[PDB]
Design a protein around this nucleic acid. Structure first.
Ligand SMILES: [Mg+2]
Ligand SMILES: [Mg+2]
Ligand SMILES: [Mg+2]
Ligand SMILES: [Mg+2]
Ligand SMILES: [Mg+2]
Ligand SMILES: [Mg+2]
Ligand SMILES: [Mg+2]
Ligand SMILES: [Mg+2]
Ligand SMILES: [Mg+2]
Ligand SMILES: [Mg+2]
Length: 224
RNA sequence: GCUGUCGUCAGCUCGUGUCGUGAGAUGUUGGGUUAAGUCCCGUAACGAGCGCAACCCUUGUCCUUAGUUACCAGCACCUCG
């Protein structure tokens, strides 16, 4: 989008040069000041390809699950994935939400029953110890499976903000065989993702920019 | 069928998922804490069962119900029980 803007935010920044992956040497503009710099002139065409792919796919009542768990990075995803549907996760990705979805459905149902009991008019009208225990279990279940309450089926697409941090999710998606959108970094691994985006991590501006791009992308692609 | 013992020690397993060509392994490992696989947070695991704890009996405080063959604060009789 208009070049300079992400050239201001954080995008042309790589994870040093001691810790790097040669598999994406073709995406590197050239290391300067002991830091690898991503080739900004090449990312944007593929970024727009991902934009149009997700916009076209969203038309048809399609849900794309977002993953953004990280140090102070899940909080922005919490509301960026909010609205326009788009189920998400915001905490530690518990392995098995895709291959073992049958087990996860029981946890979803239990959480729904617990929250319905909690909000029915405060059914927990008994000793404060029992009510507090139920409340903390309920909030733990929320922190784990808040964004999965909807989407009883399996998602047909998936978006990642740091492909190295959640390699479990990419492995699960490959095993199930669903497309993956990924923001990759110079120390990450390009394979597994079907629409790779060579950006930057650890930059709040960068993650927010990608999230807004895709949020209004799915907004304008879901007009029908 | 019934019983001892390890031992009233905190352990013993399963479903789905995942890793390994396999026997198998993860869950059940880590840092704390507890009498306890008790609990917290982390964590390719997510859940469940038999165990631990709880529900049972007795004792230790108090309230109500009730005063016979039980008791005697107060009144009286008293042959002073
Ligand atoms: Mg195998
Ligand atoms: Mg071994
Ligand atoms: Mg073993
Ligand atoms: Mg072993
Ligand atoms: Mg086994
Ligand atoms: Mg097993
Ligand atoms: Mg064991
Ligand atoms: Mg084992
Ligand atoms: Mg237990
Ligand atoms: Mg017991």
């Amino acid at each position: 989008v208009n070049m300079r803007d992400m050239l201001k935010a954080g995008v042309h920044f790589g994870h040093q040069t001691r810790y790097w992956n040669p598999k994406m040497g073709k995406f590197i503009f050239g290391a300067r000041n002991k830091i690898h710099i991503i080739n900004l002139e090449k990312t944007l065409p593929m970024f727009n390809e991902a934009l149009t792919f997700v916009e076209r796919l969203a038309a048809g009542k399609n849900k794309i699950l977002f993953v953004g768990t990280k140090r102070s990075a899940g909080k922005i995803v919490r509301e960026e994935a909010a609205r326009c549907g788009m189920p998400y996760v915001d905490h530690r990705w518990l392995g098995g939400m895709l291959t073992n979805y049958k087990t996860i459905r029981q946890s979803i149902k239990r959480l729904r029953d617990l929250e319905t009991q909690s909000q029915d008019g405060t059914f927990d009208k008994l000793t404060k110890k029992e009510a507090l225990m139920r409340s903390r279990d309920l909030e733990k279940l929320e922190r784990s499976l808040g964004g999965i309450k909807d989407m009883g089926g399996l998602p047909d697409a998936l978006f990642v903000i740091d492909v190295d941090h959640e390699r479990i999710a990419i492995t699960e998606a490959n095993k199930l065989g669903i497309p993956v959108i990924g923001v990759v970094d110079t120390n990450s691994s390009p394979e597994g993702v079907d629409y790779v985006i060579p950006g930057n991590d650890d930059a709040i501006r960068a993650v927010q920019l990608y999230l807004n791009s895709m949020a209004e992308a799915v907004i304008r692609g879901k007009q029908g």
